[PDB]
């Protein structure tokens, strides 16, 4: 039996309300190391990956690797019922067709044990190996949220550039264009609000801006995010969740093809 109990439960609420928007269907996977999600979106354009490590949990007890394709907008709607400081316990049996969620209220008086059924589906399984990422920056979450709400009123294609002067977020659109330039931090005493850069070569890439709005629903999850990019590789958006684990939003660029040249 798979039982995972975690004390402060706004994190599991927000991480999956950020999962509802991007994809319609996901592949829950359980093992000894932790919970894995390696399901792509319905458009076969962008990917979400979750590794929620077991050592962060208050209580973790798992039998073996098991994959079940639970829908996400339903889990997000039922999970919205939980409070912002609840204690969350996922429970699944060995071979049952229903999983349960236990929410324990901060008042130590209210208990809320829900359950939902399962459904079958057919989704590609994909595995990402390790490639050097030429440019990696550390972005505050709210700053990135204002970025994604700021560029998306212009158009739908985003330029994510990384040069010696810093990082650039651009977008063209029917009403013109927008260019947002950010530089690294030097003399700030705090880390959760600062921005840090590291590079190997200048990177000039473009990505789908709508899927960044779909991504950035996990802004209040944690105040930091890793933006990683290199030549001809999918864009990496690493939202770390406390000491729990991390999520990678994989945004496949729409690479320019040599047609007119």
């Amino acid at each position: 039996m798979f039982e995972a109990r975690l004390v402060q439960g706004s994190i599991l609420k927000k991480v999956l309300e950020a999962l509802k928007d991007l994809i319609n269907e996901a592949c829950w996977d359980i093992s000894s190391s932790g919970v894995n999600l390696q399901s792509m979106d319905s458009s076969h354009v962008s990917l979400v990956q979750l590794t929620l490590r077991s050592e962060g949990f208050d209580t973790y007890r798992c039998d073996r690797n098991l994959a079940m394709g639970v829908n996400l907008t339903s889990m997000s709607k039922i999970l919205k019922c939980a409070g912002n400081e609840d204690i969350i316990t996922l429970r699944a049996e060995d071979n049952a067709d229903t999983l349960a969620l236990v929410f324990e209220a901060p008042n130590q008086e209210k208990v809320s044990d829900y359950e939902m059924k399962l459904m079958d589906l057919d989704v590609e399984q994909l595995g990402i190996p390790e490639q050097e990422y030429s440019c990696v920056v550390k972005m505050p979450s709210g700053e990135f949220a204002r970025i994604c709400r700021d560029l998306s009123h212009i158009g739908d294609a985003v330029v994510i550039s990384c040069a010696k002067d810093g990082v650039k977020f651009s977008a063209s659109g029917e009403l013109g264009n927008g260019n947002i330039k950010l530089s690294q931090t030097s003399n700030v005493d705090k880390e959760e609000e600062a921005v840090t850069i590291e590079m190997n070569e200048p990177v000039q890439l473009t990505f789908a801006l709508r899927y960044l709005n779909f991504f950035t629903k996990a802004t209040p999850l944690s105040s930091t995010v890793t933006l990683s990019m290199s030549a001809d590789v999918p864009l990496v958006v690493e939202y770390k969740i406390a000491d729990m684990g991390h999520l990678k939003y994989y945004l496949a660029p729409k690479i320019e093809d040599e047609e007119g040249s």
Binding site: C27, M40, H44, V45, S46, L47, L66, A67, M68, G69, N95, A96, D97, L118, D120, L121, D122, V123, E124, Q125, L126, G127, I128, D156, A157, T206, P234, Y250, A252, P253, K254, I255, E256, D257, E259, G260
Partner: protein, 1138 residues
């Protein structure tokens, strides 16, 4: 009704028919007759007993006419339990003393009876009375008391079903003794002591020329208000006897004298009129009445005169010391019509309403005249016609005589032969086939054919209430899913344009092994010509192989297509003929098990599927039981005003059903957000193939009768052309009479045939079987989706419209081939190949091998045979195909397109807004211009450029706000002309723009503006009162003709601008809404289909919906969409457990 009143009515009608020259035969003798009229009339017999009869009205060749009063006792049938037949008669023969003519037993077969072919007949009890009034008395006595007993399920309680009770009595006489209208009869009057004898003379068929009186009027009217029935006077009246015309005017309202004059639109119709002028209304009405007396007509002709002309003339005559009753014989009846006691009233609008196959956009005089007769009558506006006549009334005379000549010749060429050919088989007098709908006349025809088979007739079915399908879920509507109508693509498909064709080589390999079979079947079943008389079989059966192999090695090409309307002339008659489906035979498993014919391995079952649709309440059984138990003992307002409070348990079913629907319309409106849930499921029907063949054979008999009459029509048309080349008058006249008789007979037969489908599902139809329409339309969808998938394999489908596919095929496809045959009957035979392969694919999947027939009734000999008349006729290569596309996400327009014939003429518009009702005149002349201007061009972009060079004109007009274009034709360019359906208080709380403008006219003119039904509401939307919905901006066009200060005051109180100073039409009308309407039209028709075919936007003046433009720019973007699976390596495949 008192019997004294009936006797007075009968003697008055006898005298009135005497003064119209239909003298009754009282002496013995022979006579020849041609029935033109049947009426029910009380006639006193020799026993001095009250008794009904039917007055037939015969005319002869020389003009002499007479009447015959045939008495036949009214009767019907009652059903009793087995072993309780004589006892019911014994009870009944001692409870209506002096009332029953007689009672007997007439055994007949049933249609829903189990084990019906063992040899049993459920014998009924036949009850016959004397008069129709006593018939109504006894039916009102007996029918509800046992009808409720049958619905919920003393010797009287053992009767189970009153059968055949809604039939008219005289129609039962027309069925029984076989006297139809418009046949020749030999009548022997052998005296009072015996009933008169009538026999059918079928040797003579030449149609005599009756006496017909058409009439039309003009009426004086105060401006802006239609003429009334208590202050106005008839402006003048024109009328027609057998082509000859007389007009009667009135001096006090005409400006000078007018003499005799003629008016002929074409040599076919001659319009000689003689004009009479009289000082006042008295001489007008008396002269018209006495001319009717001296001419003695037999059939009247009006044109929308049943609701306008007769009531106004009657109301005007009854006040001036006269009476329409005592002078001409015209008055209201129970159904709100004008039925003469001695004459047949023909309303020529009903034929346009029912039989003309026209939309409701062509019922007015001008469009219905130009749609069938072929000429355009003179246009006159009712508002200014009085003032125009005051200056000179000759154009008024022209308009009135145009009305008269149009209605008369519209009768005598089209309505008269078609109606007089309908009634040769339908047992209705002419005033019944014209008035009743297509359902009732087919009901009477099947009434005849099923009386010929000696089977009792089903009752008109009771309407079902509180429908229960699976678990509660009370259905607002229960329907069968009809024909799958889909437009698969959109845009242009012209004959000489190149189109990219993908082709599956597997389908061509499939046709490699079947060309021999297809061209064997093309002659063994479609021409009935065996191959042993043709010798060119090897030439076609290697030419097709060579062409199909040349197509095979390149199954991806770019060349011109051929457009084919691969359809069936009448698929719905053809399927019901082919499968031997009967509305009296579709049964479940229990009744088949009750039959003793359930042998192992039987063939009397046939299985079929169909799709059932339901729109039902979200409530359950409990949530409906709660509201029906709650509504138990509460007061309700009575239907009669100023009535006492009345409770639920004595309500009629209609009002309580309406109240339950209203209650459940808001109980679940705030509990489930929706009122009905659309649910489509599958159902399976099992059909017996040995039930009475009174329907499938009837359809077949009419099909082969239509074929035979079409052949005779063809040979008589060739004879008519030879005769008009000859020039001998008598033979030309006889040949033309026979030609129009046969043409009207075949047109009547096909009008019956097309409406056999439409009768079965009708409310209040005797053979109500939902399964018939369901399975027949499901089969008609399955055959056409098989055709569409085969075409999608070997070409491109374009349209499916539940009658056939429209198709573009490669130009090198085998299209048609000839055959030299040594047979004398058919020396040469040509046939099209796509039709042939469709025939062979539908006789590889739709062969009714269980198609059962009778051979010997005595020994019960049943023969199974195979025949499929389902044929895909091809209409040859058309020139152009037009499809529009929708603004809405994904979906596109259905059941609407525009196809052209070979020579560039318009072949067929269908479903478009150009000829709708309720549409503006700006979006109709636009469509008519752009379609005729569309076909120009060389390549795909040239066509869109050429049609944009004409569709941008009607944007240049609206942007310039019609500066140089005169305002005289502006007023009708915008004006709305929708029509009402009910009265304003019938609508109740419902609100819309037409209701709003009718209420604006209610507070601008009198209440009598909106009391009459079918009001032509006219309204436009103004600009100044913004923010509100367009309901409150619906100002009438009626105000613009009124007095100026009235316009000012009503404009101030309506559009709420007291500071306004300009009242021009050019500025009060917001052009943005009209530009939006024409833009939605142009992006329905042109812009979106042009974008869907990878063509640069033809007209830049209108913008696409947001889903179109974004995708367009993406496809024309430098970066190209790159996915993740093709971009980056994979891992594998997996599944998820329970």
């Amino acid at each position: 009704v008192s019997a004294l009143k009936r006797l007075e009515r009968s003697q008055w009608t006898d005298k009135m028919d005497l003064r119209f020259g239909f003298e009754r035969l009282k002496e013995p003798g022979e006579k020849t007759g041609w029935l033109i009229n049947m009426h029910p009339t009380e006639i006193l017999d020799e026993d001095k007993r009250l008794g009904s009869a039917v007055d037939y009205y015969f005319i002869q060749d020389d003009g002499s006419r007479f009447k015959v009063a045939l008495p036949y006792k009214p009767y019907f049938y009652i059903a009793t339990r087995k072993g309780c037949e004589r006892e019911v008669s014994s009870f009944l023969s001692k409870k209506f003393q002096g009332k029953i003519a007689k009672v007997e037993t007439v055994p007949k077969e049933d249609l829903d009876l189990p084990n019906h072919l063992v040899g049993l007949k459920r014998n009924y009890i036949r009850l016959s009375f004397h008069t129709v009034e006593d018939l109504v008395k006894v039916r009102k006595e007996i029918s509800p008391a046992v009808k409720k007993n049958r619905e919920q399920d003393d010797q009287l309680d053992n009767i189970v079903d009153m059968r055949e009770y809604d039939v008219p009595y005289h129609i039962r006489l027309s069925i029984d003794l076989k006297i139809h209208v418009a046949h020749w009869y030999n009548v022997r009057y052998r005296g009072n002591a015996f009933p008169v004898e009538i026999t059918r003379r079928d040797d003579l068929v030449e149609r005599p020329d009756p006496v017909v009186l058409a009439f039309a009027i003009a009426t004086t009217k105060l401006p802006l208000k239609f003429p009334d029935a208590e202050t106005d006077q008839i402006m003048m009246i024109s009328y027609m006897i057998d082509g000859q015309g007389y007009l009667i005017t009135n001096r006090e309202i005409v400006s000078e004298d007018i003499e005799d004059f003629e008016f002929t639109p074409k040599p076919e119709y001659e319009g000689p009129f003689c004009v009479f002028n009289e000082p006042d209304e008295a001489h007008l009405i008396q002269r018209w009445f006495e001319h009717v007396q001296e001419t003695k007509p037999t059939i009247m002709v009006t044109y929308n005169g049943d609701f306008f002309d007769w009531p106004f003339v009657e109301a005007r005559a009854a006040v001036h010391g006269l009476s329409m009753q005592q002078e001409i014989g015209f008055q209201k009846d129970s159904q709100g019509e004008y039925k003469a006691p001695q004459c047949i009233h023909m309303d020529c609008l009903r034929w346009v309403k029912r039989d003309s196959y026209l939309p409701v956009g062509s019922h007015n005089l001008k469009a219905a005249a130009k749609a069938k007769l072929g000429y355009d009558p003179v246009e006159l506006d009712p508002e200014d016609m009085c003032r125009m006549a005051t200056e000179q009334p000759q154009t008024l005379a022209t308009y009135s005589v145009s009305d008269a000549v149009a209605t008369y010749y519209l009768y005598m060429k089209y309505v008269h032969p078609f109606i007089f050919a309908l009634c040769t088989i339908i047992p209705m007098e002419p005033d019944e086939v014209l008035r009743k709908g297509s359902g009732t006349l087919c009901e009477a025809l099947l009434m005849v054919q099923a009386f010929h088979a000696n089977i009792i007739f089903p009752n008109k079915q009771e309407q079902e209430f509180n429908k229960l399908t699976d678990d509660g879920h009370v259905l607002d509507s229960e329907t069968y899913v009809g024909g799958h109508v889909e437009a698969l693509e959109s845009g242009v498909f012209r004959s000489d344009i190149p189109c990219r064709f993908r082709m599956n080589p597997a389908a061509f390999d499939f046709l490699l092994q079947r060309v021999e079979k297809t061209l064997r079947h093309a002659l063994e079943e479609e021409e009935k010509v065996p191959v042993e008389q043709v010798t060119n079989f090897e030439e076609v059966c290697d030419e097709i192989k060579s062409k199909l192999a040349s197509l095979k090695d390149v199954p991806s090409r770019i060349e011109c297509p051929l457009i084919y309307h691969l359809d069936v002339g009448a698929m719905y008659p053809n399927i019901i003929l082919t499968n031997r489906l009967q509305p009296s035979a579709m049964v479940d498993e229990a009744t088949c098990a009750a039959c003793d014919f359930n042998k192992p391995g039987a063939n009397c079952q046939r299985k079929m599927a169909w799709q059932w649709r339901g729109e039902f309440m979200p409530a359950s059984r409990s949530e409906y039981h709660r509201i029906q138990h709650q509504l138990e003992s509460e007061k309700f307002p009575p239907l009669f005003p100023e009535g006492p409070a009345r409770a639920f348990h004595e309500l009629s079913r209609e009002e309580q059903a309406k109240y339950e629907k209203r209650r459940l319309a808001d109980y679940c409106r705030k509990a489930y957000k929706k009122i009905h849930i659309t649910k489509v499921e599958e159902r399976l029907t099992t059909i017996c193939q040995r039930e009475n063949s009174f329907y499938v054979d009837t359809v077949r008999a009419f099909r082969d009768r239509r074929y035979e009459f079409k052949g005779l029509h063809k040979v008589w048309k060739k004879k008519l052309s030879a005769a008009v080349e000859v020039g001998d008058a008598a033979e030309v006249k006889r040949c033309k009479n026979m030609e129009v008789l046969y043409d009207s007979l075949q047109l009547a037969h096909k009008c019956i045939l097309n409406s056999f489908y439409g009768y079965v599902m009708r409310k209040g139809a005797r053979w109500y079987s939902m399964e018939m329409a369901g399975i027949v339309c499901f089969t008609g969808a399955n055959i056409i989706t098989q055709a569409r998938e085969l075409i999608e394999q070997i070409g491109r489908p374009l349209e499916l419209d539940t009658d056939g596919i429209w198709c573009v095929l490669p130009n090198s496809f085998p299209e048609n081939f000839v055959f030299k045959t040594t047979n004398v009957k058919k020396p040469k035979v040509t046939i099209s190949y796509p039709g042939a392969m469709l025939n062979i694919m539908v006789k590889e999947g739709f062969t009714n091998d269980q198609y059962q027939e009778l051979a010997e009734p005595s020994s019960l000999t049943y023969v199974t045979r195979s025949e499929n008349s389902i044929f895909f006729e091809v209409d040859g290569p058309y020139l152009a195909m037009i499809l529009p596309a929708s603004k809405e996400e994904g979906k596109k327009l259905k059941k609407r397109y525009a196809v052209f014939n070979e020579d560039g003429s318009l072949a067929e518009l269908k479903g478009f807004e150009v000829k709708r009702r309720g549409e503006l005149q700006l979006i109709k002349i636009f469509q008519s211009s752009v379609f005729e201007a569309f076909l120009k061009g060389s390549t795909l972009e040239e066509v869109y450029g050429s049609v944009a060079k004409v569709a941008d004109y009607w944007l240049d007009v609206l942007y310039s706000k019609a500066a140089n274009m005169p305002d005289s034709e502006l007023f009708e360019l915008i004006s709305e002309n929708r029509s009402m359906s009910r009265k304003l208080e019938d609508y109740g709380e419902q609100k819309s723009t037409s209701i709003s403008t009718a209420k604006r006219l209610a507070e601008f003119l009198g209440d009598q503006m909106v009391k009459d039904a079918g009001l032509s509401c006219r309204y436009i939307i103004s600009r100044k009162p913004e923010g509100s919905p367009v309901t409150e901006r619906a100002i009438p066009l009626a105000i613009f003709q009124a007095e100026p200060t009235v316009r000012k005051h009503f404009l101030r109180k309506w559009l709420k601008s007291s500071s306004l100073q300009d009242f021009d039409i050019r500025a009060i009308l917001d052009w943005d809404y009209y530009i939006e309407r024409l833009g939605s039209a142009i992006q329905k028709i042109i812009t979106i289909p042009a974008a869907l075919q990878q063509v640069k936007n033809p007209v830049p003046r209108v913008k696409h919906p947001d889903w179109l433009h974004k995708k367009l720019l993406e496809k024309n973007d430098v970066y190209k969409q790159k996915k993740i699976s093709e971009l980056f390596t994979l891992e594998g495949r997996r599944q998820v457990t329970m």
